[PDB]
Design brief:
This is part of a larger assembly, with four copies of chain A.
Chain A (H helix, E strand, L loop, with lengths): L33
Protein name (chain C): Portal protein
Organism (chain C): Salmonella phage P22
Subcellular location (chain C): Virion
Chain lengths: 33, 51, 51, 51
C-alpha cells in the first residue's frame, strides 16, 4: 500500500514491551529523560 | 538520475491500488474477520480504502 | 461458381477477443520508499489522463 | 489551460455511484461487514444511499 504500514510500530511498545517484535532491527529507538 | 523511476507497473497478482487481494480474496471463502482486541482498531485501519 | 458463403473462420478468431483480457492487467506507479520526500504524498498529482 | 477540471467519462461496470461504493466487495454472497460492540460512530455513514 503506501506508508500507512505504521501500525502501532512507533508508539505503543516503546516504554515497556509487552508482546515483543519479530526480529527487532531498531538501530536506536527509545529515549529516556 | 535514479532514486526516481518510482512509477511503473507491478505484474503479478491483479491487486489494484487499494486493497483487492491484499485485503481479502475472491476465491471460494467467507467470514474473514478473526478475534482480537487490537484487531478491532487494526481492522479500522483496513477498510478506509479508496482515495 | 457458388462460393464464398461457406467460409466459417472468424468465430474462433474473434472469440479470442473475450480471451484476451481476463486478468485485469490494471496497476501502475509501484509505490515504495525510494528517495527524497517531494512529490509522492498525493501519489499522481498531474496525470490521470490515461483514464 | 484547465486544472479546475471536474467530471470526465467514467465508463465502466453497471453500478451508478453517489456514495454506493464504500462496499467494493459484493460479488454474490451477503453479510460482509465486521463487528464490535462499544465504539462505532463509523457504521452510520455507510448505509444511507438514495439521497
Amino acid at each position: 500500500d503506501g506508508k500507512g504500514v505504521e501500525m502501532m510500530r512507533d508508539y505503543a511498545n516503546k516504554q515497556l514491551i509487552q508482546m515483543g517484535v519479530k526480529k527487532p532491527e531498531t538501530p536506536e529507538e527509545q529515549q529516556w529523560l | 538520475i535514479r532514486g526516481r523511476y518510482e512509477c511503473y507497473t507491478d505484474v503479478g497478482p491483479s491487486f489494484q491500488s487499494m486493497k483487492q487481494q491484499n485485503r481479502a480474496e475472491i476465491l471460494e471463502l467467507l467470514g474473514k474477520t478473526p478475534q482480537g482486541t487490537p484487531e478491532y482498531q487494526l481492522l479500522l485501519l483496513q477498510y478506509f480504502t479508496l482515495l | 461458381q457458388y462460393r464464398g458463403q461457406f467460409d466459417v473462420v472468424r468465430p474462433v478468431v474473434r472469440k479470442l477477443v473475450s480471451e484476451m483480457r481476463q486478468n485485469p492487467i490494471d496497476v501502475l506507479y509501484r509505490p515504495k520508499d525510494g528517495a527524497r520526500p517531494d512529490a509522492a504524498d498525493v501519489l499522481m498529482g498531474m496525470y490521470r489522463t490515461d483514464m
